RNA sequence: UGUUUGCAAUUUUUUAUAGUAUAUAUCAAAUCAUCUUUAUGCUAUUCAUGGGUACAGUAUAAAAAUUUAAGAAAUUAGGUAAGAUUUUGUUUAUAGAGAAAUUAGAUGUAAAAAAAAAAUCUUAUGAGGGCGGAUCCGCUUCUAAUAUUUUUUUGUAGUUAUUAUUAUAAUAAUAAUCAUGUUUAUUACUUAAAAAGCUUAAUGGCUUAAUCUUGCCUUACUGUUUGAUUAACAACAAAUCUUA
């Protein structure tokens, strides 16, 4: 989130509009998933899905 | 960093309060007097002793 | 007229400066800023 | 400071002994 | 027994009471004098921090109970006669006076939701905001029955003094601050005006009074001085109005300036305050009661006469 | 335990409460002031009458805990000292009343 | 028998010209009370007792 | 008056004062407060004998008698057994010497009392920081679905204690670390130590893989043992080393 | 003005800089205070548990009598539980004259008065 | 103050030793600067 | 000799010793300005300005102090850390006090403790599962975790007291039960909407912080640079956000 509340992607991926009742009961969030078939919000107990993002 | 305020209390004494009936009890007060002889009190007021005829 | 633009001159005598605004009915400005000539944080003081 | 008063007070006592 | 074996065998609480001979040779005043030296200091030199940065800061503050702590207040010094009197005798009566017998197998009452929701067949009712409090804008607290587990008691007392004229004569606030100092035994906190009125010359956000709050035994002792030494001496006093009460178990009333000097703490030094600078105070007695009638009943149990307002 | 505890806490109050200003209760050079000063000298400067002899300040302030059997912490000793103070020791002229001509309370 | 509880502000009990056939009266503590009254009569009225 | 007696204040105060136990100091309030706790510990020990003999009666009782069978008999002895443990801790939690012995490190950790205070010390600060390191560094849910630590673990490299979550040098972390573990539970159990590196970069599949840098098992540990050196896991102490200590390393460029 | 200065001198003493500092106890003194603290809190428990035990017993006695009273009948041609329903009424309990001022006003005192009790009181 | 003097001497020596070391190293820093 | 005078009590570090990496002591720093004359004076008494005497735990003559409220005022707005979380209005009551002045209030619940059976999905960097083409992709069984069921149940004690039976104890029922803790308890969840506050109108947002309070600060930094504003304003330029 920027200064004026503008939301930007931090990673390459696909935009996903969802609601996280575990995080906040009455908020709606925007995310970015590395796999288009994934669904948010990710279960709090699942391992974090992250990409290396480096070249050798 | 919330400040921890220190209590500012004045010197206190232990005073004997002798009511108009002669009964004496101990109290914690700030006055320097040792014995407070009370000539007038609830034990010598008609409003608190409506049935008493001596005060009537 | 109420606000003036002052110049905070470096005290490393490197000639770098910072310009900030402040009201006339106030005290002179004085800050610890980064001088890019010597590449170190030095004391900057108002010009006059 | 405190010990200084001790030496000065003790010194004053020696002057007083001679007076007495 | 194996359970007893797990206990600390070197128990110090089971040691014999000290003897008399050893008691005679224990003279803390002689030990220091004979040494003629300063004992080395201990390496444990932890002192309570002046500021609590947070729960994970390396240096933490101790609980207020600890004597070294900067919030420590010496414990009780005596038993207030009014706190003893109420609990020993009065308490059994209030429980007896106000009692409603519940059958043996009465089902527990389920408290109703005071913020109602919309239930019905209209598709709009699902996501409607919870309804407002029915009646008053703010929800009033529900009364608790007087049982052996809930006996109304006095908790704290707040004495508040408002001195509008102080703004112009700053010496009215200094004297006012001193009166509440000796009357209650605490350091009053100055208060500021909040409204602006040109007719009354009242200006907003300026120091125009002080207040104090005494808790625990200090509150009980304050009631003793009020009910038995101050209030009986007021001339032509009728009693506490029967309309007093905020609807939650708190009683409030006001004293006149000539009755504030009747306090035993104020009269002894009545000549130390400049003339006609003694203020009037508002005394708010906060109790554990949950209703106005339960509070008035409590005060009646402590010898407080009420008059029909 | 209650008696010992109160005495223990009363002495702790000496080390944490503000000092007593006699000027706030007695006017200088009066019967009350002079009478308070004489009795204050008998108490060795302690403005209180139920805590014995203890100085919150000084090199010997640490010794605030009485030994076993201390009559000072008893209630009979408190009432005795407090009643030995209510008697006036100075007449209205500022002269110390003789010890034999003092009226007990 | 249902026993109510009463508080006496002042005065003394007088058995003169009593309607009920009462002979003597005495004010006893909780300790002396159990010795005078019967066991069953005492076991029923001991729940009303107080600390002191 | 050597260093084996304590600090300079003790060695100094132990030669200018009298020889008398701390519990026997002739102080009014201290001896009047020790008499209240005295008859209390006697009342708690008198309760442990009444609850102990009450279990035998319930133990030697046919399950058929209980209206709930054998299930209602184990839940009644469960609450009784737990009620005894609290009485054993409440019998010495007020002792002034037990507090002194535990603070001086000379307390026996095989007794419930000392383990109760030792656990109340760990939770006060040490648990809080490690509970924070687990969340902030994303140990959970990365490694485990949910984890609430129950024992203390402090690792030191070459004597110097390293704080939790501290970037260490590749030379300092070249030898097996020493674990200063304190267990607050009763009995002796086997503890398995696994050091896993969860940030090994795999450039082929564009993701991270997990690499185990140390693995050991079958390590007997009691609440009286404090230090464990990961070097002598199979030489001095009993244990099975699945994989010896691998020097941590991190290639240039990767976080 | 001189009287006001006397007032200020009282507040100047209560200033945070003038008041005494936080206590500084050694280990032996601190441990001794810990026992005094520990015992006092336990002593309150015993007074609390004792005060709460008596309050519980009294309530049970009232409930027993009330529950029993509800089942009884009479006197004479009165329906069962009439007396129970009459006892639960709270007429004047929350009024102004509910509890007599004299009984409540009298409190416990360390020592008795000149006349501890008045037997000459007449209706 | 028979045995305490011996202990105080160990205290004074330790303080004096460090005070000498502090001055023996502060002089070194003033040479590198 | 900083740190409370009766004795290994906080964290890290320095040094030393024993020791084969641990252990104790020691040192420094952080946390905190606790006040420190061992008596030299005072007090009482006595004896000729003076000389003694006093014997101290019920401590003492032997140190109660020895050479003008900022926590009553300032509406100070940014970085960062911590703490607090309805502050507005309305309403109730409250000496002076009135339509209009201050203060105190204004939701409810929980805190001994569960175990166990199957089912419905969903997930898993779980079994490197199996089969097609360890990790990719499509199929997939098993375990695990979350969610859900009103599901299938079992247990719901112990402690204090009461009552009932039984021979102070046992059993059953009933009521209470967050409490080893300075009751001003504490901690967690909950408490419609509007309103207050956030440099200024209006709109949206924030109460889990963007508000408020406090501590230390001045990144309101220098150079270059990324991706966007469905390719800013339907061009260009001046602009806005953002990355390294
Ligand atoms: N505070 C707790 O630890 C605690 C624990 C369980 C229950 N409760 C409940 O809280 C309510 C009040 O607690 P409480 O019973 O401890 O009240 P309390 O009377 O014992 O304590 C209240 C205040 O009075 C003081 N006090 C108590 N006894 C005293 C005495 N003998 N002499 C002088 N001062 C004394 C205390 O220091 C405290 O400040 C009760 O209903 C009780 O059941 C409290
Ligand atoms: K700030
Ligand atoms: K609201
Ligand atoms: Mg802001
Ligand atoms: Mg408001
Ligand atoms: Mg365009």
Task: Calculate how close chain I gets to G4, using CA atoms only, in Å.
Answer: 10
| C-beta atoms surrounding E109 within 10 Å | 6
Q: Which helix (H) or strand (E) holds C21?
A: strand C17-23
Reference E259, options E268, E251, E267, E249; nearest CA is: E267
Orientation of helix H28-59 relative to helix I27-71, angle to 10°: 50
- The sign one gets for the Cα dihedral H13, H18, H22, H25 is negative
Q: Which helix (H) or strand (E) holds B16?
A: strand B13-18
Reference E73, options I19, H32, I47, F53; nearest CA is: I19
Contacting residues for E118 by C-beta, under 8 A, at least 6 apart:
E124, E125, E126, E128, E131
- Which tokens sit at A21? 């009742």
- Which tokens sit at E219? 């509150």
Å from CA of E131 to ligand 3 middle: 12
**K109: residue with closest CA to C1':** E111
* Max CA pair span of chain I: 84
d(CA H38, CA H31): 10
Q: Which nucleotide, over all strands, has the C1' atom closest to the CA of E133?
A: K192
Q: Which helix (H) or strand (E) holds B2?
A: strand B2-3
d(CA F6, CA E74): 10
DSSP B45: -
Residues of chain I in contact with residue H34, where contact means CB-CB under 8 angstroms, are: 35, 39
Please check whether residue C17 is in contact with residue C9, taking contact to mean a CB–CB distance below 8 angstroms: yes
**K136: residue with closest CA to C1':** H205
β-pairing, B13-18 with B35-37?
A: parallel
Please check whether residue H231 is in contact with residue H175, taking contact to mean a CB–CB distance below 8 angstroms: yes
E79 phi, psi to nearest 5 deg: -95, 115
Q: Is E87 left (phi over 0), alpha (psi -120 to 50) or beta?
A: alpha
H57 phi, psi to nearest 5 deg: -60, -45
Please check whether residue I16 is in contact with residue B6, taking contact to mean a CB–CB distance below 8 angstroms: yes
E105 phi, psi to nearest 5 deg: -115, 40
DSSP F67: B
Residue in the structure block whose two tokens are 């609830």: B42
DSSP F100: G
Q: Reduce the secondary structure of H109-122 to three states and give it as a string.
A: CCCHHHHHHHHHHH
Reference H244, options H212, H214, H219; nearest CA is: H214
Reference E187, options B5, H109, G29, B39; nearest CA is: B5
F53 touches strand K (CB under 7 A): yes
Residue in the structure block whose two tokens are 């070097």: H231
| C-beta atoms surrounding J26 within 10 Å | 9
Q: What is the DSSP string of chain H?
A: --GGG--HHHHHHHHHS----GGG--BHHHHHHHHHHHHHHHHHHHHHHHHHHHHHHHHTS-TTTSTTHHHHHHHHHHHHHHHHHHHHHTTTTT-HHHHHHHHTT---TTSHHHHHHHHHHHHHTHHHHHHHHHHHTTHHHHT-S-----SEEEEEETTEEPPSS----TTGGGSPPEEEEE--SSS-EEEEEEEEEEEEEETTTTEEEEEEEEEEEEEEE-TT--EEESSSTTTTS--EEEEPPPPP---TT--
Cβ–Cβ gap H22/I35 under 8 Å: no
| E217 ligand 1 Cβ < 6 A | yes
Instruction: List the single best residue of I7, I16, I97, I101 to mutate versus B (max B Cβ within 10 A).
Output: I101
**K28: residue with closest CA to C1':** J18
Q: How far is CA H158 from the centre of its chain?
A: 23
d(CA A20, CA A34): 18
d(CA E104, CA I64): 10
E187 touches strand K (CB under 7 A): yes
* Max CA pair span of chain G: 36
Omega of the bond leading into F82 within 30 degrees of 0 (cis)? no
Cα H217–H221–H225 angle (5° rounding)?
135
Orientation of helix F2-16 relative to helix I27-71, angle to 10°: 130
Reference H162, options H191, H133, H198; nearest CA is: H133
- The sign one gets for the Cα dihedral G28, G29, G30, G34 is negative
Q: Experimentally, how was this structure solved?
A: cryo-EM
- Which tokens sit at E305? 């006469």
- Which tokens sit at H172? 């300092």
Q: What is the DSSP string of E182-223?
A: HHHSS--EEEE----BTTTTB-TTSEEEEEEEEETHHHHHHH
I48 touches strand K (CB under 7 A): no
β-pairing, E51-52 with E250-254?
A: unpaired
Å from CA of A4 to ligand 4 middle: 15
For chain K, which bases have at least one atom within 7 A of a protein Cβ? 1-14, 21-41, 49-51, 56-74, 76, 81-83, 89-109, 112, 122-126, 134-138, 144-146, 154-163, 169-177, 180-185, 190-193, 205-206, 208, 210, 213-215, 217-223, 227, 240-243
Smallest CA–CA distance from H251 into chain A, residue: A56
Return the ligand 1 atom nearest residue I45 CA: 16
Return the ligand 1 atom nearest residue I48 CA: 15
Orientation of helix H8-16 relative to helix J2-32, angle to 10°: 160
- The resolution of the experimental structure, rounded to one decimal in Å, is 3.0
d(CA E45, CA E51): 17
Name which of B6, B42, B47 is nearest E228 (Cβ-Cβ). Answer: B42
Residues of chain E in contact with residue B33, where contact means CB-CB under 8 angstroms, are: 268
Task: Calculate how close chain H gets to I59, using CA atoms only, in Å.
Answer: 27
H179 phi, psi to nearest 5 deg: -100, 120
Q: Which nucleotide, over all strands, has the C1' atom closest to the CA of I26?
A: K4
Alpha helix (H) ranges present in F1-105? 2-16, 31-42, 75-83
d(CA G18, CA D4): 91
d(CA H223, CA H150): 13
* Max CA pair span of chain J: 47
Please check whether residue H104 is in contact with residue H97, taking contact to mean a CB–CB distance below 8 angstroms: no
E237 phi, psi to nearest 5 deg: -85, 135
């Amino acid at each position: 989130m920027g200064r004026d509340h503008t939301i930007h992607a931090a990673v390459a991926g696909y935009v996903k509009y969802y609601r996280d009742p575990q995080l906040h009961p009455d908020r709606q969030y925007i995310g970015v998933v590395f796999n288009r078939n994934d669904k948010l919000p990710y279960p709090k107990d699942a391992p974090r899905k992250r990409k290396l993002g480096l070249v050798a | 960093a919330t400040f921890v305020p220190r209590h500012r209390r004045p010197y206190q004494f232990t005073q004997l309060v002798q009511l108009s009936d002669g009964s004496t009890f101990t109290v914690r007060t700030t006055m320097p007097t040792a014995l407070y002889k009370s000539a007038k009190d609830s034990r010598n007021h008609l409003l608190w002793q409506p049935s008493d005829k001596s005060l009537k | 007229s109420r606000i003036i633009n002052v110049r905070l001159i470096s005290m490393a005598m490197t000639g770098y400066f910072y310009t900030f605004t402040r009201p006339r009915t106030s005290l002179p400005m004085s800050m610890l800023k980064y001088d890019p000539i010597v590449r170190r944080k030095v004391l900057f003081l108002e010009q006059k | 400071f405190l010990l200084g008063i001790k030496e000065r007070k003790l010194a004053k006592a020696d002057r007083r002994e001679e007076y007495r | 027994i194996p359970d007893l074996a797990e206990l600390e065998t070197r128990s110090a609480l089971d040691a014999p009471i000290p003897s008399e001979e050893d008691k005679k040779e224990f003279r803390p005043w002689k030990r220091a004098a004979d040494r003629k030296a300063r004992l080395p200091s201990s390496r444990y030199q932890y002192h309570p921090p002046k500021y609590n940065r947070g729960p994970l800061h390396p240096i933490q503050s101790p609980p207020s109970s600890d004597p070294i702590a900067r919030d420590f207040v010496p414990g009780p010094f005596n038993m207030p006669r009014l706190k003893e009197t109420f609990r020993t005798v009065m308490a059994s009566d209030l429980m007896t006076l106000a009692y409603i017998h519940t059958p043996p197998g009465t089902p527990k009452k389920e408290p109703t939701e005071r913020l109602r929701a919309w239930e019905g067949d209209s598709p709009y009712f699902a996501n409607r905001a919870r309804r407002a409090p029915r009646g008053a804008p703010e929800l009033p607290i529900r009364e608790r029955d007087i049982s052996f587990r809930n006996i109304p008691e006095i908790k704290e007392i707040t004495v508040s003094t408002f001195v509008p004229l102080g703004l112009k004569n700053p010496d009215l606030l200094i004297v006012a601050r001193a009166v509440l100092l000796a009357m209650t035994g605490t350091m009053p906190e100055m208060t500021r005006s909040k409204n602006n009125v040109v007719q009354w010359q009242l200006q907003a956000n300026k120091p125009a009074g002080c207040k104090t709050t005494i808790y625990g035994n200090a509150a009980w002792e304050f009631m003793d001085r009020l009910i038995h030494l101050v209030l009986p001496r007021i001339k032509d006093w009728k009693g506490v109005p029967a309309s007093t009460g905020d609807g939650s178990g708190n009683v409030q009333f006001g004293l006149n300036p000539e009755d504030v000097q009747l306090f035993p703490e104020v009269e002894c030094n009545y000549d130390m305050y400049p003339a006609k600078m003694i203020p009037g105070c508002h005394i708010a007695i906060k109790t554990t009661a949950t209703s106005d009638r339960q509070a008035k009943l409590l005060l009646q149990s402590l010898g407080v006469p009420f008059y029909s307002n | 335990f209650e008696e010992s505890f109160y005495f223990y806490q009363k002495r702790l109050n000496e080390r944490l409460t503000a000092p007593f200003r006699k000027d706030f209760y007695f006017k200088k050079d009066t019967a009350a002031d002079l009478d308070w000063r004489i009795k204050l000298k008998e108490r060795h400067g302690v403005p209180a009458k139920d805590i014995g002899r203890y100085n919150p300040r000084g090199r010997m302030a640490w010794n605030d805990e009485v030994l076993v059997g201390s009559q000072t912490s008893s209630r009979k000793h408190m009432v005795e000292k407090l009643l030995a103070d209510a008697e006036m020791r100075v007449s209205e002229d500022g002269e110390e009343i003789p010890a034999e001509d003092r009226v007990p309370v | 028998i249902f026993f109510l509880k009463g508080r006496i502000m002042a005065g003394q009990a007088d058995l003169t010209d009593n309607l009920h056939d009462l002979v003597d009266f005495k004010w006893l503590t909780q300790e002396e009370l159990r010795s005078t009254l019967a066991e069953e009569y005492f076991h029923s009225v001991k729940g009303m007792f107080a600390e002191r | 008056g050597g260093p084996e007696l304590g600090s300079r204040r003790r060695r100094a105060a132990l030669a200018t004062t009298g020889n008398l136990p701390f519990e026997q100091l002739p102080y009014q309030c201290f001896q009047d407060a020790r008499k209240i706790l005295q008859q209390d510990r006697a009342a708690k020990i008198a309760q442990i004998v009444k609850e102990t003999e009450k279990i035998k009666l319930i133990e030697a009782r046919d399950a058929s008698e209980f209206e709930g069978g054998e299930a209602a008999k184990q839940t009644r002895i469960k609450s009784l057994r737990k009620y005894i443990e609290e009485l054993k801790i409440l019998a010495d939690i007020n002792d002034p010497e037990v507090k002194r012995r535990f603070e001086d490190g000379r307390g026996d950790m095989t007794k419930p009392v000392y383990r109760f205070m030792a656990e109340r010390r760990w939770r006060s600060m040490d648990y809080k920081i490690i509970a924070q390191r687990i969340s902030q560094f994303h140990v959970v849910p990365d490694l485990l679905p949910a984890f609430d630590p129950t024992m203390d673990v402090k690792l030191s490299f070459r004597g110097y204690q390293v704080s939790p979550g501290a970037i260490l040098d590749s030379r300092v972390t070249e030898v097996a670390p020493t674990l200063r573990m304190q267990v607050f539970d009763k009995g002796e159990r086997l503890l398995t130590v696994v050091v896993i590196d969860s940030d090994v970069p795999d450039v082929t599949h564009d993701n991270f893989k997990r690499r185990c840098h140390f693995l050991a098992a079958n390590i007997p540990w009691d609440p009286s043992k404090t230090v464990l050196s990961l070097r002598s896991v199979g030489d001095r102490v009993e244990g099975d080393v699945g994989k010896p200590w691998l020097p941590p390393f991190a290639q240039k460029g990767s976080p | 003005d001189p009287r006001i200065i006397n007032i200020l001198r009282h507040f100047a003493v209560l200033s945070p800089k003038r008041i005494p500092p936080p206590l500084r106890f050694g280990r032996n003194r601190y441990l001794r205070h810990w026992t005094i603290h520990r015992a006092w809190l336990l002593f309150r428990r015993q007074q609390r548990e004792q005060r709460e035990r008596i309050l519980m017993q009294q309530h049970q006695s009232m409930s027993n009598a009330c529950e029993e009273l509800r089942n009884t009948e009479g006197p004479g041609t009165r329906e069962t539980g009439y007396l129970y329903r009459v006892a639960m009424l709270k007429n004047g309990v929350y009024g102004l004259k509910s509890i007599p001022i004299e009984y409540a006003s009298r409190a416990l005192v360390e020592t008795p008065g000149r006349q501890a009790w008045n037997h000459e009181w007449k209706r | 103050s028979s045995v305490i003097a011996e202990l105080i001497k160990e205290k004074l020596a330790a303080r004096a030793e460090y005070n000498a070391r502090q001055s023996a190293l502060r002089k070194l820093q003033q040479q590198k600067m």
